[PDB]
Structure 1
Amino acid sequence: APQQINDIVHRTITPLIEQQKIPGMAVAVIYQGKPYYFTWGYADIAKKQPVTQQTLFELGSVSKTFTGVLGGDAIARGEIKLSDPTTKYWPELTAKQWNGITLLHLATYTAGGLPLQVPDEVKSSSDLLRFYQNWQPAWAPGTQRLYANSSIGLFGALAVKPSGLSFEQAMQTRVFQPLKLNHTWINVPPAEEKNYAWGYREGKAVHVSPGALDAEAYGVKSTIEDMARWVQSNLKPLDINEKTLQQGIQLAQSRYWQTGDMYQGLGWEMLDWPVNPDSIINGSDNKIALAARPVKAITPPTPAVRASWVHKTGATGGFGSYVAFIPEKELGIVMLANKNYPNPARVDAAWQILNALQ
């Protein structure tokens, strides 16, 4: 690692870990296309098992980037269109409020106020239908962006229906394996249990629990090395040999809606580079990130702009993650931690590091 990398990383992350009391953390910085790795702390406190290159973390909502890209792949395959009504793939959703709600809306949180979370009481596919059939929008389709598991989650589950494959098998066969993410799982197999960090919420060790649309919204676990490879793949989709995966990646970074200075892709979110740091830092605070905001349609969507800051936050009960990258400058960062700590702290650190290297 060039000194400047070490310099910044240690200066920025160390106090961050101490400030946020983070038990374990892994950081990857992609600099002129190459990854550089840093780990701190314990994956398992009680076991005193260190974080390593092989430790799996719960990505939480960073999983949405996989879901957007898989969806992008399905479009490229000619299997769905984002202009398809949701009812085309779920005909049992017959209540009148669904008419005019398209896959684009679900994927980009503009269906009209689908809720932030699918309620814990929703378990069976029966509950799931009832939940969406009873939901009442707060706004008309395509007018407001309200960040929501239940929106992008539904998108993921429906996007895979023409393939006939489950969501997990589609993700594994169409995205993980081709990008050679061999330590990335929706369901961590036994041979990896020893590498799967615990999360910590107020001192208690926790792992995410089964939830409806969990795999689609928040259920990916991956290592720092596989997450660097995800970033490289999204920095440079042209190096990618699978035609439809290449195209799916590019579509996930198309700009479909603008709210303030951000643009909504499929999973990914984007801003023009150069970016005002206050804007992404402050925008990451849940009082803005979770608020409803008006959207302007970009008709037709703007193709992936290389001069972009492209990013996504995610968290579970016990974990906190952030990924950001700038395709023009071949620069990116991954931050995985096994405590959920405030979004703006992550984004601030990330900006300090990548600003210092740009």
Structure 2
Amino acid sequence: PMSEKQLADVVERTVTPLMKAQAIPGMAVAVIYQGQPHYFTFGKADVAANKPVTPQTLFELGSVSKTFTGVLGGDAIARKEISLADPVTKYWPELTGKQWQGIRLLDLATYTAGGLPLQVPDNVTDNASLLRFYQSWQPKWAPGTTRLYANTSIGLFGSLAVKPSGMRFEQAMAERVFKPLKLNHTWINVPHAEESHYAWGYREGKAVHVSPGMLDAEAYGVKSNVKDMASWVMANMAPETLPPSTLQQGIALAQSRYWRVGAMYQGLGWEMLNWPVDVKTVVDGSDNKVALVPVAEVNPPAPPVKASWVHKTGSTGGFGSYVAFIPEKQIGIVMLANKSYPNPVRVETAYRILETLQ
């Protein structure tokens, strides 16, 4: 096996030229190897203040948040509070339009409603306007037949999935996911007392934080540090080491295979490819296209496959994050950066580091 010094050299030799070429001010990396997290930090969390990235620096996870939403939804299924087969209208009866007949929680969770768009419009700022948005939406294809990656899809899934619990989404996430996993520095809203740890993001050289928006918490709103994110990867890679619970069951539901697009399988938030797989296949299987694509159904959904590359990319205006793991090999990686840089580059960087552990 690689020593800690050998692993540090692999990470540093990869990340240093990457950060220079991409103008990424700061990165935090965790490698999961031999059952242990290994932390590596680089650069600046706050350029103007010359504050370094540390293992306590909070980054915006952007769409990596969808993995938390998927697991929380899986937990609600395991609690018997919701079923993926339930109609959307069971949880939002005001969605009376005929286009909503036949659309299920499954379709919201996995982007198969028939072309719900990527973003909630910024001018939609309350529930009355959000209702009008969904009631005006016209699908392009029948439900359960196409994939279009969308915050309006999985974001609405998360909001509806928590309704039987009596808690708002943020409360439910804290009580049912963050707290049982001891993710005590993972936040949907960064508390005032934690702001000193919150990195700035950088877009066109300017310091930025994610803007508020409807469904933000559900689709892109989690902030976390590299230590909690390493714990999140460990819990999802080896849920059998957790005590028996609805959360453990929900982790399994989120890594179940519901649809296939090419070499990618869609979970709840998580996405998977069968392992072994070449890096070019992972890159080609992780583009969320602007246009709709057809899907193949996995019926019934297939339970988690240990021989998988499991991953999620995510960004905000100022941040770029990536998590990936291979349960068969018990290796994984977290890369948090305070600039958004291309998703294929995140995959290539992660794949190269993980390949040295094999």
> Is 51-60 or 232-241 further displaced after alignment?
232-241
CA distance, structure 1, for counterparts of residue 322 and residue 140 of structure 2? 30
CA distance, structure 1, for counterparts of residue 292 and residue 356 of structure 2? 33
Cα pair 2:253 2:303 within 8 Å, conserved: yes
Cα pair 2:86 2:104 within 8 Å, conserved: yes
The structure 2 residue matched to 1:75, chosen from 74, 77, 83, is 77
CA distance, structure 2, for counterparts of residue 133 and residue 242 of structure 1? 41
Q: Once the 2 structures are TM-superposed, how far is the Cα of residue 109 of structure 1 from its aligned partner? A: 0.3
Secondary structure at the residue paired with 2:143?
A: coil
Deviation per CA, 1:107-164: give whole Å up to 9, x if none: 0000000001111111000110000010011111011011101100000000000001
The structure 2 residue matched to 1:97, chosen from 96, 99, 107, is 99
Residue 310 in structure 1 maps to residue 307 in structure 2: no
Which amino acid in structure 2 is aligned with residue 125 of structure 1? N
Residue 222 in structure 1 maps to residue 219 in structure 2: no
CA distance, structure 2, for counterparts of residue 137 and residue 205 of structure 1? 38
CA distance, structure 2, for counterparts of residue 291 and residue 233 of structure 1? 33
Partner of 2:263: 261
The structure 2 residue matched to 1:210, chosen from 209, 212, 216, is 212
Partner of 1:331: 331
Partner of 1:21: 23
Deviation per CA, 1:48-73: give whole Å up to 9, x if none: 01100100000000000000000000
Partner of 1:298: 298
Residue 119 in structure 1 maps to residue 150 in structure 2: no
CA distance, structure 2, for counterparts of residue 81 and residue 95 of structure 1? 21
Q: Once the 2 structures are TM-superposed, how far is the Cα of residue 289 of structure 1 from its aligned partner? A: 4.0
Cα pair 2:257 2:298 within 8 Å, conserved: yes
Any gaps of 5 or more consecutive residues in structure 2? none
Q: Once the 2 structures are TM-superposed, how far is the Cα of residue 7 of structure 1 from its aligned partner? A: 2.9
Partner of 2:149: 147
Cα pair 2:309 2:326 within 8 Å, conserved: yes
Which amino acid in structure 1 is aligned with residue 328 of structure 2? E
Partner of 1:130: 132
Which amino acid in structure 2 is aligned with residue 104 of structure 1? L
The structure 2 residue matched to 1:250, chosen from 252, 264, 286, is 252
Q: Once the 2 structures are TM-superposed, how far is the Cα of residue 283 of structure 1 from its aligned partner? A: 3.4
Partner of 1:36: 38
> Is 236-245 or 18-27 further displaced after alignment?
236-245
Secondary structure at the residue paired with 2:211?
A: coil
Secondary structure at the residue paired with 1:39?
A: strand
Which amino acid in structure 1 is aligned with residue 285 of structure 2? G
Matches within 5 A, 1:151-162: 151-162=153-164
Q: Once the 2 structures are TM-superposed, how far is the Cα of residue 250 of structure 1 from its aligned partner? A: 0.5
CA distance, structure 2, for counterparts of residue 322 and residue 351 of structure 1? 11
Secondary structure at the residue paired with 1:64?
A: helix
Residue 355 in structure 1 maps to residue 345 in structure 2: no
Secondary structure at the residue paired with 1:22?
A: coil
Partner of 1:235: 237
Inter-CA distance 186–19: structure 2 relative to 1 (3 Å threshold):
same
Q: Once the 2 structures are TM-superposed, how far is the Cα of residue 342 of structure 1 from its aligned partner? A: 0.8
Secondary structure at the residue paired with 2:356?
A: helix
Cα pair 1:32 1:329 within 8 Å, conserved: no
Secondary structure at the residue paired with 2:351?
A: helix
Cα pair 1:283 1:289 within 8 Å, conserved: no
Q: Once the 2 structures are TM-superposed, how far is the Cα of residue 242 of structure 1 from its aligned partner? A: 5.0
> Is 273-282 or 1-10 further displaced after alignment?
1-10
Cα pair 1:178 1:242 within 8 Å, conserved: no
Q: Once the 2 structures are TM-superposed, how far is the Cα of residue 241 of structure 1 from its aligned partner? A: 1.9
- Percent identity between matched residues is 72
Which amino acid in structure 1 is aligned with residue 39 of structure 2? Y
CA distance, structure 2, for counterparts of residue 347 and residue 133 of structure 1? 37
Which amino acid in structure 2 is aligned with residue 190 of structure 1? H
CA distance, structure 2, for counterparts of residue 242 and residue 187 of structure 1? 29
Cα pair 1:147 1:291 within 8 Å, conserved: no
> Is 342-351 or 73-82 further displaced after alignment?
342-351
Which amino acid in structure 2 is aligned with residue 57 of structure 1? F
CA distance, structure 1, for counterparts of residue 132 and residue 317 of structure 2? 26
Which amino acid in structure 2 is aligned with residue 9 of structure 1? V
Secondary structure at the residue paired with 2:187?
A: coil
**Cα RMSD, aligned residues only:** 1.0
Cα pair 1:201 1:317 within 8 Å, conserved: yes
Secondary structure at the residue paired with 1:357?
A: coil
Cα pair 1:199 1:338 within 8 Å, conserved: yes
Cα pair 1:24 1:51 within 8 Å, conserved: yes
Which amino acid in structure 1 is aligned with residue 82 of structure 2? I
Q: Once the 2 structures are TM-superposed, how far is the Cα of residue 10 of structure 1 from its aligned partner? A: 1.4
Deviation per CA, 1:165-191: give whole Å up to 9, x if none: 000000000000000001000000011
Which amino acid in structure 2 is aligned with residue 301 of structure 1? P
TM-score normalised by length of structure 2: 0.98
Which amino acid in structure 1 is aligned with residue 89 of structure 2? T
CA distance, structure 2, for counterparts of residue 275 and residue 5 of structure 1? 23
Residue 164 in structure 1 maps to residue 166 in structure 2: yes
Q: Once the 2 structures are TM-superposed, how far is the Cα of residue 356 of structure 1 from its aligned partner? A: 1.8
